[PDB]
Amino acid sequence: GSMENFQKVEKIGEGTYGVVYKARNKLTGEVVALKKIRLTEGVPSTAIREISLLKELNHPNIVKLLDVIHTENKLYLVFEFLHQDLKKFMDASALTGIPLPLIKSYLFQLLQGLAFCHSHRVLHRDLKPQNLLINTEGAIKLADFGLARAFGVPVRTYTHEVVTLWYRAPEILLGCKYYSTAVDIWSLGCIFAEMVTRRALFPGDSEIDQLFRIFRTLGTPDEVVWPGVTSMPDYKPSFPKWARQDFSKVVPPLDEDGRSLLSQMLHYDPNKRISAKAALAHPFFQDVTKPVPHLRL
Template sequence: MVVCAMHPPASHSAPSFLRQYAGHLGRTALRREPGGGLERDRAYLSLHRTGSLGIVHENVKMGSDGESDQASGTSSDEVQSPVRVRMRNNHHRRISNEDINKRLSLPADIRLPEGYLEKFAMNSPPFDKPMSRRLRRASLSEIGFGKLETYIKLDKLGEGTYATVFKGRSKLTDNLVALKEIRLEHEEGAPCTAIREVSLLKDLKHANIVTLHDIIHTDKCLTLVFEYLEKDLKQYMDDCGSIMSVHNVKIFLFQLLRGLAYCHRRKVLHRDLKPQNLLINEKGELKLADFGLARAKSVPTKTYSNEVVTLWYRPPDVLLGSTEYSTPIDMWGVGCIFYEMITGRPLFPGSTVEDELHLIFRILGTPTEETWPGITTSEEFKTYNFPRYNAEPLVNHAPRIDNDGHDLLSMLLQFEAKKRVSAEDALRHSYFRSLGEQVQSLADTSSIFSVKGIQLQKDPGKRSSVYPESTQGKSRRQSVLF
């Protein structure tokens, strides 16, 4: 993913760009939390004097000027060490772990360092007033955020050109995490995909998007700490013997569309949707991952690269060289994934661009001016000289799909990008009526499984509830990890 305004100059090193980027992240916007009241609960990067790059979570009440540094009554130049923090409370009650968790927006299951409770209670602003940013950074650093020693490496999950991914464990929560170590080449700085992933994930907070917990920066490595999910959708389908329950297909598709609709509302395109980039935990929660190719997009006509999206899930307009696209680029991939879940096999498994287009046109028919206005004048299209294929009913290829599912699939697999259904509209399609009305009004951070009665069914071809850590399985996750 790339934030358009944040391209790192080629001449800048990774540390210098990340330092500038850290300053940029400090300027966050207001949002309203479910509990009410205007607060900030945003993650931003902080460069410490040691050169480490940490992630800090804010939950700060805002002043009328939109800033909070001075709101606590302590200027940024006069901020005291958290060791000298003193609690001034009207009731003089004893400070608790819950107080600190709430004050610093920490997970409920976090383990605070020994003696930290007493240090924090020594000298802090009253709890009804916000902390300064500088004090918050120092407090979180003392707890252990932004430090490699906070995480224990376990199994190596895979290795790519720029990154190695390990299964790990956080000493702060004892929870499993995924540690994505990105090597920093001194000549090139941080890989562009790493900057993209950090740039966008720090702003995406949704139940169906993988969570970025922490960021650690050293001279040689940038480590992204993600929540750990047991398997990806491809592995899940393999475990089912390629025969998934149609009910489970519906639940996974709804979650995919929820996460995607959230991204698209924020003008973020994923651009690399495929089963290997959709992670699933033991509860059945599906989450979008691998935002290395994603991009923040504000102008619908902006030109981007056409070398995006794995071939099997790439829409025909991009295959034919289009570099002007918007959110519909992701919707074609959703249709391909929907079909693959229903049938257990990929819809268009082409080996080359030409082969991919042939497979698409064999099933959907060779496009004409009626089905795709302007296609006959496309130089790329004329170059291939495709045979005239007649469209085949999709239901012939996916007999397990019902009429509503067939209708939704057809709306996703439209040649013309502007005719593809949006993620937001797809969520309201009659195909999902059986899930009930409550799933349509979930808060962004609420799981679909928080709705009473929503649960996965046993898949007909299910072989095992535990994913075997085989070499084959690891290779299937390479695209997620790198």
């Protein structure tokens, strides 16, 4: 691999450090995304984790890192090209909705990708629709591993400031010393609800607002539902105590199997929350297939 073989097509995104281009390999024809990483503290730790972790993670539902081109002044990551992110797809499906067969296909694939990460001791820690990429053949893939982390068993304390707020698990919000694979499941559950409604489940504007939004939907957790909760660093006894909603009112269009799965993905207690691996076998997926997206990308 070398930069001279690539013809740039257009810009397709940005982050840090931080521009992403769609390009094409002049010799093979292959269309790729080039994530440019501009190089006073040397190679950024986010790039180091992203590259080293993605080189181990080869799976149909994890974005494929093809190559790393590392000049002295520049670092280019070459990924397989994927046409759209799930957020843009949901916006483009407004007023119509995403067909249930596609929602089910996407969730099933996301769970496969995530189970594979967790089996390889990787926490993603930034699952949100903007970081989930779809192609024209019906695949959806985990992307943006800059915030990911290789974990140990049992986990140690890691960075506290993780996961975009709307998708952040209650154990992170309440300052637990340890968090684990369950935080990625919480995020997928929020994403599941969002695919059905096309709006964020818990759109808070601050950590406390975010907590209270969760509490008003699922009930303020107590020692019965979540042993240890009143002992956590950022739990306050002054928290309002909201009743738990009938789950059928949380995402009304969802059938019984759907509701069952969503509820197990949004369980308060991280120890009880369903795992990706176990979720693959949920009756919700009894009829799952993999259709192409219903809209042009």
